[PDB]
Subunit: 461 residues, 4 copies
């Protein structure tokens, strides 16, 4: 009824995950509406350029763009075993006056391929502000936490202190590259236009009695009507399936970024340092994003393979595949960005869990700070280094062998050797003094790189 | 209605491609009904093993296996953000008596993982007879055409003659390897059974007051009820997702086979030697098979990646992915097998086209046999080789430079140097003499390898 | 030099990673020596079946199996742009008496494909005992640690306790499935044998003057000489490239398993519960490397899938360059991973006092039901007790997250006279060995029923 | 040997396929010379910026950039189990005065990552002119063959005529999209620069005693010394591995293009319409087969960096290292080989016009029937009636072809039928192949003038 009977398989991307907006863009109502819209634009342009098409035929066509008899369309397709021709017949039935001029000069891909290009670009236009919003919410988080010291991890082992906001900027930088990629692909998408069966426009040239200029005009007119700046000069029957690679490749790369970000979030949730928005709390949304982002990456192999084995001016082995992977890649991407937005709005941070971890690990990373202090006081770097080695091993043994807390500072405190440095210990181990340039980097990044990127999307934040 | 509104995305695998039977196996009806079947079996087993579950509670559960309020379950899941708990609640709603004991001792995966294993095996069982049927129909074609000479192709260039039937056996053999793969994975599939939250059955042990024999018997009892010969001993929360790799990998390899087979048919269609069953005729069914087969191959990277990053006793980042890739792999495989059967039932061959192509190419492959005939006629191999070489270059130029028919045999016939073999030319150029052991290979293959494999189906 | 001068690219798989044994299996010496071995076996069988081949011709070839002039071969291949014909000519140069009968009746794939099948089987035979050894070492660890309680993880969040040994069985099981896979593919690998240019044996049938029996005998005999139980009946020019899918698919699956296992170890290394074999701060670098290589193993499966899908008719040569890369690389990658995993599995470091601490911080939240059950057994209510134990768990969780302190939930219960009926039981109720379920029982049954039978064939090489 | 002894595995990419120039770029000599060049630049800039480095330390480091003791470095790496530190120690041993300031403040990635970025960019600079050269050769072919009619193929079945040159433009267009992608990735490549252990420059900030300006100057000074216009602001330990996805994705899409082009060439070769250049009746399209084989590996390799980036934890994990040693080099050596081979193919492509012409003659009559019907309607005949008469003749001709294995005799059937007497005198004209190719010829001209030549202009050299 809505997403269908439960007695048959229903894609989870439709019934469970994707927004109504993205679902509609990949719906048959939208597909077949656009087929008629393209047929109308064709008749309109053809009428202007002199072909015998009456205003009645245009008005009739224009008044039935939504008037789609799916039952009739289905029966015709069972009969003809051809989907475009099924719809040509069905459109001509409710438009009896224009029936004879519908699809005039065109091959099936005039509606099929141009609709897919309109769908791709409209789908890209849906993703962009959703991605932009996720980036803005994280940028707010990053700026807010820019100076909050946190344990750094390499090999997922204790490393030089970063900040929560600086770490957030690694996430933001990858998503920003995705925003630029998606925009580039949307902006550079070209219209197939009117090209004919094998790309030569032979049909249209005959209809215009050899007038090459009128053929070029028609192609320009339908392109403009479709809202595209530019059409291919060169096609076979179809737009080059290299286009489908370009689109799904940028979505795949977005998948990898989201999977990385959400893996980091899941690890922070184990560490109790950060948690998804409101005893056992599971980072289920981040896990979902990983799950769906993995499918995005997997799907890139479909268009790669498809384009690689397209023979000459077209083989029809692209069709069933594209029905699946194009829609599912955008429905998957839509779901991910909707969820990441929801995650990024109220990430819970626990400063005192973060501080406890730093206090347990920083003493082992601060030994050169201690030597420097003792040497400046007039001690020996060689004598000091030995003393710290032993006390550090003692502390390490407590942590590993006994499961105790790190007591290195306490050992240094009660050892008389470090007499000239006892009053400095609190300053020397101040975690903010160990975070390098993290806060200055966050500011400069957001200002120079992030905010300029977001400016176009302020309207819808 | 049945597939839903055209105002929303609908999977073409559902609305366009897969059979009703496969669509039902991956339907929410079948799934949640099976969830309830597993709860019934559990309560039955747990009752036999002494837990406080009454007969009338079990009657209540059995009477309601199909009575599923999908609207309520969706209301609960919106509220609980937990799918299995929503169905526990909803089953407990229409079963007020048994409500207290549904899911007793189980974790979510008890219904979720076991249902997937039941579904995977049922799906495999739907595929197997269809694949056997394709093989059977192709075997019929291979037998009928076992001796029909046809131009061999290597580098897709003219090569040593094969037969139509022998070439078909290349196709059959790959599909036989798939049939064996699918049957193995089906037969080796193990039930998760009752394992508790992290795989230790700590819940059931406590319910049975430390009695291990009862905990093992429960696992055995529910496994048997589900009709599985064997259950896992070792699990985390889930069955190992390596299982999903094993299943989709064999599906991926089936895809590769069908893509190659259908690519060959498409090329033969261009050559006008073969056509799909009944001016332009397009091998559309073969093209669609290729299209879908490619998706089957692509899908293997999903379970590979999933398994690689499951942490400890399980992470929930397998869940959304599996909802998509498992169903799709099987619905795609189903479609391909349904279409491949259609293709295999009336393949059209054009012997006269096949013959004409052999006549254009065989003379170039027949020159060593002409030379052999001259040598034994009291002649020189080196002289003949040079004479035959110039005429073969002459004929090759007519073909490529003049777009003409190959006239090499006519050139040989009129050149008096070949007087010692002129009377043998009809014999020397008989295409059936050039196919080597192709028909005998077909006979032995079908007899020894194919027919024994089909005998159970 | 051994791996060439540093002024050109050199594969890390050869210069850095794989064992010498696996490198040699994928060497040109081994390849081209096997070409010659195959030529000798063909001449042997042909002579037996009556073709005009002499004992001295066979003696000559046998004497020169290893006497490969690589420079001459390269020179000839530059002239002929054909690798097999280059080696036919080179072999005939050093075997002048045999030159005329080398490769008699055969197409190039007689040496190319059959050598690849010999290599694949030999390569699997190198991997098998290495995996068996990894499984056995982990099985020893699993038995040793079968009762050692450890915090369970689902969502990587605290869950019902498992044991260190039981968790190891999750890893072992996957590798046992791989071991079975590799053995199956190895055992079921069929020989191409002698098949001719398009698979019809037309050349051989003519040589034997139409005697079908003799062609069938030839194929049997060379298959037997190469040590294979079974040859294909049906081929085009090549063995079906579906074979390459079957082999690299099992390697890909092994890759996923090792990636999972080594990710778990790296996570245990962060938690300080387990470390790699022998400093305070240590990196799981070997596990990281195994993950890095395992990923390449999974990636490589798409090569033979694609290759097989677009082979036209009796074969196209677009498989050749690809197979030179992916078959060797997959095995060199797999070999390295198993060499490293063996090393990781020997002396895995465990820290029971870190494990215990973590358990004590998390168990009380998972033990509330037991503390309630004990009150109801004493005489208290379950509705009343569940509420009072709720609020204490709330404050303890807040101490952990808001204060950043230790879990004081058991102290809150201890210092509260409502839980007076059960105060003396608290240690018994919180005994972590009482929460591990059937973990240790499962380890024993698994090892005895599933693991040890698999390992028994490999006992002499352990 | 020079590729090593035949007793061990040797990559066919080095031993067999790639050019010596691309082999050199991914060689250890080039890698470790660049490590030392980077150490020289770090010291140079550090000296200028006031750190205690002498001129004879710099004179020493500069004079030993090529004097690499690989044996010593290998010994050191076995001992340290650390490749970078082995080379710090080895470089310090031949530069004993400078030993104590080599790598000052830096982490291993300073040399590791920056060298990889230098190599990636130099690798892309080798490919670019090669791809431009292929496009240029193909454009000459397209121009020469712009108007030559050839049978169109859709479903790989006879379709509306195109031209040899127009079909070549489908190939050219995909390669032009690749040239733009590679150029884009190359230009947008950012330097990692000096970032420290976890990306915070804490080491350098200390060395400059809190002077942030000097840390920023150092990052700019080395970035500029390396010939890069821009450095990252935000890194962890490493440059984001999304960079590797971006680079191998464009190579993967290039593989798809080449696989399609070479598949078409292989099909044309079967049809005897086109052949690879002469280096002879049975000829195999072996170069094109090889290109398809390698292209496939290029497409396969994209899943490596996708997976790598998706599971990088925090400021980095070392599970990327081994994978990248394989896939980055292999992708570029594979790409290099394809382009070398494709240029070779494109240089003397052979066309057989009489074969092409014969195929057209066999197939065109069946596509000419609508045009014959139109000429009869113009002469006074009924469309419906004429369609029926011509349909029987057409079905008779198709049966001669398929059932008798004969030549298409449809035109002869029409010529001797008195029914078609009104158009008999027009048949020669109605069946002219050039008249069926539509705008194919003008499309080649416009495409080459507007979209190809401007892209090639910069590469003139
Ligand atoms: O415009 C034409 O019809 C000309 C034809 N090109 C085609 N162009 C577009 N669609 C075509 C084409 N051919 C078939 N079909 C129809 O597409 C449908 C494919 O079904 P599916 O494989 O399920 O996606 C399915 O309905 C097919 O009938 C050509 O010969 O070049
Ligand atoms: O036995 C034959 O030669 C018959 C031929 N089949 C072939 N079988 C095996 N190898 C062949 C074949 N053809 C070429 N080549 C040679 O393979 C080599 C391919 O080189 P690469 O692409 O670099 O791997 C390269 O050396 C090629 O020359 C056929 O026409 O069916
Ligand atoms: N450990 C678990 N086992 C089974 N299901 C779970 C678990 N944790 C959460 N879930 C639920 O499983 C579903 C996952 O949804 P999805 O990510 O869309 O597959 C959600 O309803 C979760 O609440
Ligand atoms: N954080 C790091 N950055 C760079 N290199 C490292 C780091 N940690 C270890 N290494 C070294 O990098 C090399 C990784 O080797 P492989 O995994 O074979 O590429 C080894 O020599 C490691 O010791
Ligand atoms: O909800 C469950 O069934 C399991 C949850 C978990 O393991 O965290
Ligand atoms: O050895 C290094 O350069 C870095 C090591 C680390 O980050 O752990
Ligand atoms: Cl059109
Ligand atoms: Cl359970
Ligand atoms: Cl069709
Ligand atoms: Cl052979
Ligand atoms: Cl390390
Ligand atoms: Cl640095
Ligand atoms: Cl060749």
């Amino acid at each position: 009824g809505d997403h269908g009977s439960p007695d048959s398989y229903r894609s989870p991307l439709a019934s469970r995950y994707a927004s109504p907006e993205m679902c509609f863009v990949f719906s048959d109502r939208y597909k077949f509406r656009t087929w008629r819209q393209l047929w109308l634009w064709l008749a309109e342009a053809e009428q202007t350029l002199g072909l015998p098409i009456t205003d009645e035929q245009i008005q009739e066509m224009k008044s039935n763009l939504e008037n789609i008899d799916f039952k009739m369309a289905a029966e015709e397709e069972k009969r003809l075993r051809h989907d475009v021709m099924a719809h040509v017949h069905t459109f001509g039935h409710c438009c009896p006056k224009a029936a004879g001029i519908i699809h005039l000069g065109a091959t099936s891909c005039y509606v099929g391929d141009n609709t897919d290009l309109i769908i791709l670009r409209n789908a890209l236009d849906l993703l962009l502000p959703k991605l932009a919003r996720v980036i803005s919410r994280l940028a707010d988080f990053a700026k807010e936490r820019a100076s909050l010291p946190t344990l750094g991890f390499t090999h997922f082992q204790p490393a030089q202190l970063t900040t929560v906001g600086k770490r957030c900027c690694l996430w933001i930088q990858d998503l920003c590259m995705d925003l630029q990629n998606l925009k580039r692909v949307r902006d550079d998408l070209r219209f197939r236009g009117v090209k004919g069966t094998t790309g030569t426009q032979a049909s249209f040239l005959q209809l215009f009695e050899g007038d090459d200029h009128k053929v070029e005009q028609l192609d320009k007119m339908v392109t403009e009507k479709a809202g595209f700046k530019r059409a291919f000069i060169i096609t076979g029957q179809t737009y080059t399936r290299k286009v489908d690679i370009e689109v799904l490749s940028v979505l795949a790369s977005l998948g990898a970024s989201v999977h990385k970000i959400c893996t980091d979030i899941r690890l922070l949730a184990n560490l109790k340092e950060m948690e998804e928005p409101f005893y056992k709390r599971n980072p289920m949304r981040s896990e979902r994003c990983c799950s769906l982002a993995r499918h995005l990456m997997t799907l890139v192999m479909d268009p790669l393979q498809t384009a690689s084995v397209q023979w000459f001016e077209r083989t029809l082995d692209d069709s069933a595949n594209r029905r699946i992977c194009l829609a599912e890649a955008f429905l998957t991407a839509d779901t991910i960005l909707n969820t990441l937005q929801n995650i990024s709005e109220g990430l819970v941070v626990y400063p005192k869990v973060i501080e406890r971890r730093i206090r347990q690990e920083l003493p082992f990373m601060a030994t050169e700070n201690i030597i420097m202090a003792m040497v400046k006081a007039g001690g020996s770097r060689q004598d000091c280094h030995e003393k710290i080695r032993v006390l550090s091993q003692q502390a390490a043994s407590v942590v590993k062998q006994e499961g105790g807390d790190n007591d290195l500072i306490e050992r240094i405190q009660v050892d008389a050797y470090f007499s000239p440095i006892h009053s400095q210990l609190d300053h020397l181990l101040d975690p903010s003094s160990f975070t390098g340039r993290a806060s200055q980097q966050v500011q400069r990044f957001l200002e120079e790189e992030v905010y300029p990127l977001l400016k176009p999307y302020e309207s819808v934040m």
